[PDB]
Design a protein around this ligand. Structure first.
Ligand SMILES: C[C@@H]1COCCN1c1cc(C2(S(N)(=O)=O)CC2)nc(-c2ccnc3[nH]ccc23)n1
Length: 248
């Protein structure tokens, strides 16, 4: 019994339960951008329950976390466009709350399916590797003075032209999310994402900007810390590759 199918049935059931909450209809289908004419000038990642359900049916979500991240976009988008206390945002939050209740009820089953879909989520070398990477991000990289521009995705509401310049955005929160999902099996992919932050700062702010000097320091402290842990990380990467091959 394909665990991806079972998982998808649980996620669809959660969508059914949130669709049934009061006043949720404005979130059942995509915003009509020909009626809400400025919507895409403000919102970068539109999401709604129908798109979410179709993605569940396409087997696009191998775990709770990718599903929840897309569901959370509904709330974040409403908070940005409608307002943090707007009634619509409260309604969307009520759906995220119901999702979290249901995920809590089924966490052991969901964990088992997730491990069967991707055995690396249960591999102690992958877990230790991701733990080290997360600590580099939170304890070294986010500690660079005035690194705040790079901690979270740019909000197009506050920097309206940002995404006309930066089409491949990256930030430390997204990296932490990638780490939490165990996206990185070695330092190469992690450094691809770290360096994208710096490349985007060069492109948007300029090579001589103070923003770019800060981003350069973020990248440099990443290299310095990876070098300090090189030998353990090398052991973890070798054993992760071996686990990955055995999962075949
Ligand atoms: C564009 C600059 C330089 O490159 C990197 C991004 N960085 C940012 C990033 C962010 C956010 S966010 N969630 O606010 O969008 C924190 C994640 N905000 C601003 C901002 C917002 C309003 N007024 C501003 N004046 C000067 C800057 C500024 N700038």
């Amino acid at each position: 019994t394909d665990p991806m199918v079972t998982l998808s049935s649980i996620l669809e059931s959660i969508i059914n339960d949130m669709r049934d909450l009061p006043n949720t209809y404005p979130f059942h289908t995509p915003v009509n951008a020909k009626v809400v004419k400025d919507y895409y000038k403000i919102i970068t990642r539109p999401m709604d329950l129908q798109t979410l359900r179709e993605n569940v049916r396409k087997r696009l979500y191998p775990s709770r976390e990718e599903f929840r991240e897309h569901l959370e976009l509904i709330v974040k988008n409403s908070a940005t466009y409608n307002g943090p206390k707007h009634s619509l945002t409260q309604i969307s939050q009520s759906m995220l709350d119901l999702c979290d209740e249901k995920l809590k009820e089924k966490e052991d089953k969901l964990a088992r399916l997730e491990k069967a879909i991707n055995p690396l989520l249960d591999d102690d070398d992958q877990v230790a590797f991701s733990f080290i990477l997360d600590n580099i991000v939170t304890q070294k990289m986010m500690a660079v003075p005035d690194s705040w521009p790079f901690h979270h995705p740019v909000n197009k509401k506050f920097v309206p032209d940002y995404y006309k310049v930066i089409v491949n955005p990256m930030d430390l929160e997204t990296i932490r999310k990638n780490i939490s999902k165990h996206k990185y099996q070695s330092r190469e992919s992690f450094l691809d994402d770290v360096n994208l932050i710096l490349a985007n700062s060069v492109k948007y702010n300029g090579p001589e900007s103070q923003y770019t000097k800060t981003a350069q320091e973020i990248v440099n402290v990443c290299y310095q810390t990876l070098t300090e842990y090189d030998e353990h990380l090398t052991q973890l990467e070798k054993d992760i590759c071996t686990a990955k091959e055995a999962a075949l």
